[PDB]
Design a protein around this ligand. Structure first.
Ligand SMILES: *[C@@H]1O[C@H](CO)[C@@H](O[C@@H]2O[C@H](CO)[C@@H](O[C@@H]3O[C@H](CO)[C@@H](O)[C@H](O)[C@@H]3O)[C@H](O)[C@H]2NC(C)=O)[C@H](O)[C@H]1NC(C)=O
Ligand SMILES: *[C@@H]1O[C@H](CO)[C@@H](O)[C@H](O)[C@H]1NC(C)=O
Ligand SMILES: *[C@@H]1O[C@H](CO)[C@@H](O)[C@H](O)[C@H]1NC(C)=O
Ligand SMILES: *[C@@H]1O[C@H](CO)[C@@H](O)[C@H](O)[C@H]1NC(C)=O
Lengths: 214, 659, 225, 210, 224, 217, 215
């Protein structure tokens, strides 16, 4: 019944910096703690065992310290491929338990999004259902306030937003918001607008199109 | 600003001495302040003081009159100050002193006789200064002095005419550590009346100069010698030659980066009783290396041998019969080394060995055969420490040679095997067996049959297989008084597991999966494994995910003193479950999901409790749930730690966060 | 190399029996313990339990106690993880790892690639690809964006390419979002300056492996509807 | 450290006498005061700047502070007139003295010069040489002017005279010698020794005829 | 009590070796709580420190920078004394020498020697000429009569004058010597005695001169 | 001093069931488990099983898993074993054993109970005196126990007084199905008419106790 | 199920000799062994446990050795009271198997001739219509003895039964009981009844006889 709590939950760091991740245990687990690295979608990897011991094949920049209830993972010089999700585990009890993990992200400045709104194609309307697609391209940070507006009225419940991971180049996010409405409800109205409120804009940008006029 | 009849005014940034302190104080502590001076007048009020500590200040000089104001002063501490100049008047009138601390005062030289009237002084400390000479007077004084500390100075040589002033003195300790000494004048040690302990730690010497030192210590009254971190690379039979004419009993050669120990190095020490050789770089321990050390009783070899070079394959070699000379050796500390393995005749000769610590002494002692400890056949070993040795297998009849062994620590290893019982053969004096932190242990019925005299058994986090056997593996352990089975995550346990352990007093069962055994829906009924444990004193059942407790589980635990049910999912307890616990003194139920505390359950329990621990609980704050509990709390004598801070109510939301 | 290989992803209905495999190679299989770890999409790593391949001795975490069965065949050197009755909450990724006892604690050096078990009430269905293009005159900035919408398909995954793999950078294939109905929805876009109207041909190629459906779709906006 | 003492210090009888000893930070050291009368060995009157040795009068007290070490005598008597030296060992020099102070007790009552004139002996005349001895004792102050007269005509050829020195009773003394020939001793009718003290004259006379 | 008895030659020629000796009684030379040494006083009231010796383990000695490498103070536990040796003496080394006992802790001198006088002159040390002194015709009613002795032409100083070999004490006054124009010394020592015992009591004077080895006793005859 | 006591012998009908008792004395019955052992005359032994006096846990031998049924009376401190489906192959001696401080030991044994599966109805023994017709130094007396069923029978001499020089022969089985035993004792002639000689024959199954004094001496 | 193959089954040893009984295990049972001595008609007594350890009270002459799966009970210098049956047992794994057993007999005690007696049937048995004559051989050696009944110089066949006691502890002598059973008619059919003993202890086959109605 040992609860491992790591901190922070997620952090932003530039390449080369020296990073520290903290790991706490509900009760003392001695020196039996292990640091595992996990790449998104890929199988985890054993970085450190016995809290301070370096696993064979693991980079020398990786160090581990601490005892009792307090532990710390330390990366001397951060690498571009060192951005992943780090978990800690206790081995003092046979009922092993992991932490919630620490997500390592790329630190950059604010970047404004490129908004493009796409109307339902005729092939889709031929089926009897419509899905208008709002696209936000390359922005930072991830927090974005996406609000649809059919005939200048706020929508709710029929929008689905998905965000990708950080890009391999500029380290920026892209959001895809899908608004689903039946063809009847689509031909019932005229003005279809997408409003984007971000921190990279002093005033929210609105990309609109009129039903039938497009 | 506090008073225990000993005034402690430490870290108060006082620029002047307090004048409101009582006249009952005998000890004054003024460490870490901004006192520029110490006028006698300001102490006229305090004529009953016996101890003055004014360390860590900015005091430039002292008034002689002050010494007159404190006629009963025994201890004077003037450490870490700006007291660079001493005079004949400074300490003149303080004739009743016994301790004088003068460390870190940047004293470059002591003039005439500032210590001539300190004939009652016992310990004089002058550490961390710029003294280039051990001369402290122009005549013979300080007859009652026992400890002289001139450590951490610029002293480069010990001369006769600088040391003979203690001719009528009896020194037990001459601290000259951290001094770059390069010359010992002929007869400089004989100039001292009585020298018992010499300390030349952190002193760059070398084999030759050490030989010269031992030569100048010849025919002296020396008893203790410290040469730690003196950079003693190698030793020969000539190095400690002079010590032949001494009755030396303790020698410290630790941290010397001692590479090679030549034959008959310490043959000139037939009186030596205590040998400290920890933290060194010995590559090859020869046969006659420890020749003539038959009176040595304590030997410390912690990290004394070189580490594994991995590439160069440089493992520290120990010749057979390398210990055969230490006939009176009783305590052996060989922990933390990279020795290949225990040779057939490694420990042959130690006929008085009682304690052997082999913790991490070996690179890989993966298998313990019946021929491993054959060299300990004729040794009266009582305590054997085999932790951290990467042991993976204990073969049958491996500890046959250790008939007098009492304490065996086999924890912290890779031990993964089936306990056939043959491992413990020969152990007729065994008292406690540690097995904690290992791979796996597959128990049988005859696992501990050969050692029914075992009293403490530690199986903390070792994965017990077949612990759910019908004739208990623990069955032959009648005299077993302490049993640790924690952190093993045990999911199944038979009622007859602890049967036959009537003398069991302490039981650790925390961090397992025993909840299933205490639910009423369990096929066959709940498992009452605590029946018959009349002499049970301390019980730990934390972290087991317990959510139900059968009413008659603790019915036979009359002598139960302490009970720990914390870190579980307990909520509803049946009435009269603690009714038979008359010897209960400590009750723990922290970090649970308890909402109600009623009299029908906690009635007989709260009777004679001296310690109650129900910290983190989601209490239901209604009358029918908390009335009796609060009523008992307000009038109880039971010590309840963190009662006001960590005892909060959850429901109803009106009392959410309310004590 | 010390290698752990698991079976392919599984898609089943609630209440059905399942049995996934974990085969080890390169080392003596019965020498080291084999542990199982469950990770639900988005959440952290969870400990299920472990097994000793030799005697098939099993030890489960208190939560997974009786909720799963860890087995092992010494012959094939293969540890299996099976359910008698799958549920909706068991929809997760499952890893198996080799336990190495070093530093006086069990650590997992080698892992399996992971078996994704997706359990929901649905059958296999081909995707629907619809072109995404802005209005005719609405585009006159710096760069434009064309896209493809892959909607109403089950189950995952769906591989999206552009111009038979020729078009690489500049694209954005977004994570699929689970609709209320039970069908996934994926968006895939790409940006190009002024070659939008009638300069180059941008045809997205979507491949869906389960339903054996492969669809190519040209992105274009018709002025009349 | 160079110890500096005042050359001479005078005080009235029965008053307080104070002698200073100046040195750089002399307050750090235990000063010692010695007393010395001419013709005798110096005797210690002060040790450790404040302590009196066994047998030393309580009139003598000492102090030591800053740059000054002061010796103090209350109730100054006639026996206290002498030399005073301050001392301290300090460095390997092992003993440093001062310039020396001369304590002067003021004008004691004037005394009349006790004059005694001795004629040359018999054996001296037998050895063909003569010497008249004019001996003066118990007089204050010490300043005296001696003249030798033959009858009424003074003769200064071959005259020796000492410098006045202090006795044990703080009064002065001096000697005078007149070298003559036996013939010139048997010649003049009378020989006279005249002593001048404070203006007043004390005279003695002896004759060959005897 | 602690007595210090000094001794040594009265005259030491230039470029020769000055020798002196301090004997100790009532105390031991080789003991703690006691240092020893020599201190000279030059004519002109100049008190000067020469040297010290003391025993801790061995015998340690310290000299002044003034005496440099000319002085040598060696103790002798045998005869319970300690000597003084000054090599290469110049005429300004002539002084009144006192042996001193230093008391611990702080080197104050509670015990001095009576002192001895050494002289550097390269002279020949002339013997004294003792003559009796008495009034040629003494016939008075006075109860007092003075008689003495005259020491003429001697070198060098000093000269001890006694009366009745130390029996007669009170009434004795020895006058300070004079430095004649001839360079030689002259001294007179008298005594006042009752006139009633002029012929019924004998008065003899003793004269001792150290460097010349001269001890002459002369009787003053009362002219009746 | 620790003793396990069992009845002498038991006769049973083929096909029925029989309950064997094992009383514990000298220690706390629930401390050590109780084991059972079957042994055929002249043959080897077979470990039936072990039983826990506390909860009633039973570890069986795979051959005796269907033949034997172990039970335990905690109040009377007695271990019971029921043997069902009895054939002639179950006609043997049954011991109950216990372990010691060394659990790999069977230090304590009951005197065993002889189970006979043969029916045939119990019959009592017939005791006759045995003495010569006669002169020498040593005379011999005896008792003959003829026609009984089943084994065994116990023959004492003079209520335990007579011990030395006594030979009681083993039982032989006639063709009639009845065992026949004899006992003798040699004594000096000078004590022929001076001492009393009476043999005590005791048969448990037939509950027959006879005292037969030898005359003709 | 781990088996126990014990050898031999029969031994004959004189007083003072050294004997050894062997047990073989079908599988590894480690040192967990137990040797029991059993006298005919009593309870097995624990001689050795854990193959090498002696039980409390057991004579020092009893010992045990272990080698592989072979465990040996060794008796040095046999005493006349150390004779009977001997069994072995393992305690390692359930179920527990015992050995076949080894029957130990005393040798020497240099041949002692049987004291032959003959006992006639009582009148009370003659009232039952069944007569029985009992021939006794008191204290003899060795075991091999041939008893032949003679009724009027006619060899009997089948009507006799032998019952021999175990070896006496002290004098090492046996006792044989030959019972002759005949109906009352066949009993009163002749006159001279005799029993003949052929034995190594006897010079010539001793025949003891009696006549009907004589006593
Ligand atoms: C388990 O614990 C019990 C109790 O501590 C141990 O019993 C003790 O064992 C000793 C040594 O055999 C015995 O002492 C006896 O003292 C009596 C009277 O002086 C003497 O006659 C005996 O010869 C014997 O020395 C006694 O049984 C008992 N002593 C105590 C302290 O009560 C027992 O030894 C332990 N079991 C094992 C296997 O170690
Ligand atoms: C001591 O007391 C005096 C007043 O008598 C005060 O002025 C002074 O500050 C005090 N000295 C210190 C610094 O403690
Ligand atoms: C000393 O002073 C304290 C504080 O005023 C007082 O309480 C106490 O009675 C006195 N002496 C003691 C320690 O009894
Ligand atoms: C000598 O040194 C040893 C080092 O262990 C220390 O314990 C002891 O106190 C010292 N002297 C004595 C009193 O034996």
């Amino acid at each position: 019944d040992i609860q491992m709590t790591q901190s922070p939950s997620s952090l932003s760091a530039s390449v080369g910096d020296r990073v520290t991740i903290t790991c706490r245990a509900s009760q003392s687990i001695g020196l039996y703690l292990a640091w595992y690295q996990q790449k998104p979608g890929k199988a985890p990897k054993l970085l450190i065992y016995a809290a301070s011991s370096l696993q064979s094949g693991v980079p020398s920049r990786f160090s581990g310290s601490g005892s009792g209830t307090d532990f710390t993972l330390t990366i001397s010089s951060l690498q571009p491929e060192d951005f992943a999700t780090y978990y800690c585990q206790q081995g003092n009890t046979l009922s092993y338990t992991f932490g919630q993990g620490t997500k390592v992200e790329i630190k950059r400045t604010v970047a404004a999004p490129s908004v493009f709104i796409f109307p339902p194609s005729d092939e889709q309307l031929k089926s009897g259902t419509a899905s208008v697609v709002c696209l936000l391209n390359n922005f930072y940070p991830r927090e974005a306030k996406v609000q649809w507006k059919v005939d200048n009225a706020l929508q709710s419940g029929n929008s689905q937003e998905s965000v990708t991971e950080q890009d391999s180049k500029d380290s920026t996010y892209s959001l895809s918001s899908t608004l689903t409405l039946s063809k009847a409800d689509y031909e019932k109205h005229k003005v279809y607008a997408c409003e984007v409120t971000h921190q990279g804009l002093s005033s929210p940008v609105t990309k609109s199109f009129n039903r039938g006029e497009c | 600003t506090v008073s225990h009849e000993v005034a402690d005014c430490s870290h108060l940034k006082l620029t002047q001495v307090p004048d409101d302190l009582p006249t009952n104080i005998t000890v004054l502590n003024l460490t870490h302040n901004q006192l520029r001076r110490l006028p006698a007048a300001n102490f006229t009020r305090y004529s009953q003081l016996t101890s003055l500590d004014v360390g860590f200040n900015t005091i430039s000089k002292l008034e002689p009159e002050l010494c007159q104001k404190l006629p009963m002063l025994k201890v004077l501490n003037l450490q870490h100050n700006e007291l660079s100049q001493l005079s004949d008047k400074t300490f003149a009138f303080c004739t009743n002193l016994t301790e004088l601390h003068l460390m870190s005062n940047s004293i470059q030289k002591i003039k005439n006789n500032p210590f001539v009237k300190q004939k009652n002084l016992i310990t004089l400390d002058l550490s961390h200064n710029g003294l280039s000479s051990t001369k402290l007077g122009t005549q013979v004084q300080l007859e009652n002095l026992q400890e002289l500390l001139l450590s951490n100075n610029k002293i480069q040589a010990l001369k006769s005419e600088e040391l003979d002033i203690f001719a009528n003195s009896s020194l037990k300790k001459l601290e000259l550590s951290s001094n770059q000494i390069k010359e010992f004048s002929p007869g400089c040690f004989h100039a001292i009346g009585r020298l018992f302990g010499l300390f030349l730690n952190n002193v760059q010497l070398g084999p030759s100069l050490t030989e010269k030192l031992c030569l100048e210590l010849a025919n002296t009254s020396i008893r203790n010698l410290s040469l730690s971190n003196s950079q003693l690379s190698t030793t020969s039979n000539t190095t400690f030659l002079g010590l032949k004419w001494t009755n030396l009993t303790m020698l410290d050669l630790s941290y010397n980066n001692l590479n090679v120990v030549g034959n008959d190095s310490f043959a000139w020490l037939p009186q030596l009783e205590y040998f400290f050789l920890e933290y060194n770089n010995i590559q090859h321990l020869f046969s006659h290396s420890l020749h003539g050390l038959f009176n040595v009783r304590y030997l410390n070899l912690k990290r004394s041998f070189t580490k594994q070079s991995i590439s160069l394959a440089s493992l520290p070699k120990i010749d057979d019969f390398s210990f055969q000379w230490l006939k009176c050796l009783e305590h052996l500390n060989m922990e933390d080394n990279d020795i290949p393995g225990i040779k057939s005749n490694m420990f042959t000769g130690l006929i008085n060995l009682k304690y052997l610590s082999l913790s991490n002494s070996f690179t890989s002692l993966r298998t313990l055969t019946n021929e491993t400890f054959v060299s300990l056949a004729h040794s009266p070993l009582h305590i054997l420490n085999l932790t951290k040795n990467k042991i993976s297998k204990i073969e049958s009849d491996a500890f046959s040679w250790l008939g007098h062994l009492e304490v065996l620590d086999l924890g912290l290893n890779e031990i993964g095997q089936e306990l056939t019982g043959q491992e413990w053969r020969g152990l007729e004096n065994i008292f406690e067996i540690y097995l904690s932190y290992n791979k796996y242990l597959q128990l049988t019925r005859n696992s501990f049959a050969l050692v029914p005299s075992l009293q403490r058994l530690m199986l903390r986090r070792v994965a017990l297989k077949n612990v759910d056997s019908s004739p208990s593996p623990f069955q032959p352990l009648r005299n077993l008084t302490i049993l640790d089975l924690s952190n093993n995550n045990i999911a199944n346990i038979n009622d007859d597991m602890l049967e036959g352990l009537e003398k069991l007093e302490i039981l650790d069962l925390q961090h397992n999966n025993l909840a299933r055994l205490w639910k009423h829906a369990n096929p066959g009924g709940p498992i009452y494994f605590l029946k018959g444990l009349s002499h049970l004193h301390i019980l730990n059942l934390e972290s087991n995910g317990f959510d139900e407790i059968p009413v008659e589980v603790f019915k036979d635990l009359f002598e139960l003193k302490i009970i720990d049910l914390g870190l579980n999912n307990l909520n509803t307890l049946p009435a009269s479950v603690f009714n038979n616990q008359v010897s209960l003194k400590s009750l723990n139920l922290q970090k649970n999901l308890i909402t109600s505390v009623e009299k029908k359950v906690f009635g007989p329990a709260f009777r004679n409790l001296t310690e109650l621990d129900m910290r983190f609980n989601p209490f239901d704050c209604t009358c029918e749930s908390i009335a009796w509990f609060v009523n008992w709390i307000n009038e109880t004598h039971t010590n309840i730690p963190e009662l006001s801070s960590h005892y909060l109510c959850n429901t109803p939301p009106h009392y959410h966060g309310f004590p | 190399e010390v290698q752990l290989v698991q079976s392919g992803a599984e898609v089943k209905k609630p209440g059905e029996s399942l049995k996934i495999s974990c085969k080890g190679s390169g080392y003596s299989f019965t020498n080291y313990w084999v542990g199982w770890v469950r990770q639900m999409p988005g959440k952290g790593l969870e400990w299920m339990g472990f097994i000793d391949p030799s005697d098939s001795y099993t030890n489960y975490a208190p939560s997974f106690q009786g909720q799963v069965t860890i087995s092992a065949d010494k012959s094939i050197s293969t540890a299996y993880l099976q359910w008698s009755s799958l549920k909706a909450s068991d929809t997760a990724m499952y890893y198996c790892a080799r336990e190495l006892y070093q530093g006086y604690m069990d650590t997992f050096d080698s892992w399996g690639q992971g078996t994704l078990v997706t359990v929901s009430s649905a059958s296999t269905k081909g995707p629907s690809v619809f072109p995404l293009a802005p209005c005719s005159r609405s585009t006159s900035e710096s760069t434009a964006a064309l896209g493809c919408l892959v909607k109403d398909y089950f189950p995952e995954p769906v591989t999206v390419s552009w111009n038979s793999g020729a078009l690489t950078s500049g694209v954005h294939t977004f994570p699929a979002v689970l609709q209320s109905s039970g069908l996934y929805s994926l968006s895939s876009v790409v940006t190009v300056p002024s070659s939008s109207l009638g300069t180059k041909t941008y045809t997205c190629n979507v491949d869906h492996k389960p339903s054996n459906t492969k669809v190519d779709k040209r992105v274009h906006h018709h002025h009349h509807h | 450290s160079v110890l500096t003492q005042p050359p001479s210090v005078s005080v009235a009888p029965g008053q307080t006498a104070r002698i200073s000893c100046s040195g750089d930070n002399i307050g750090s050291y235990y000063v010692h005061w010695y007393q010395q009368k001419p013709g005798q060995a110096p005797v210690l009157v002060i040790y450790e700047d404040s302590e009196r040795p066994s047998g030393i009068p309580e009139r003598f007290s000492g102090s030591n502070s800053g740059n000054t070490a002061t010796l103090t005598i209350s109730g100054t008597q006639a026996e206290d007139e002498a030399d005073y030296y301050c001392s301290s060992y300090d460095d390997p020099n092992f003993q440093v003295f001062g310039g020396g102070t001369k304590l002067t007790v003021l004008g004691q009552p004037k005394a009349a010069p006790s004059v005694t004139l001795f004629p040359p002996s018999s054996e001296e005349l037998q050895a063909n040489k003569a010497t008249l001895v004019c001996l003066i004792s118990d007089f204050y102050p010490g300043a005296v002017t001696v003249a030798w007269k033959a009858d009424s005509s003074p003769v200064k050829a071959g005259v020796e005279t000492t410098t006045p020195s202090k006795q044990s009773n703080n009064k002065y003394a001096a000697s005078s010698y007149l070298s003559l020939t036996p013939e010139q001793w048997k010649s003049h009718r009378s020989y006279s020794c005249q002593v001048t003290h404070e203006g007043s004259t004390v005279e003695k006379t002896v004759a060959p005829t005897e």
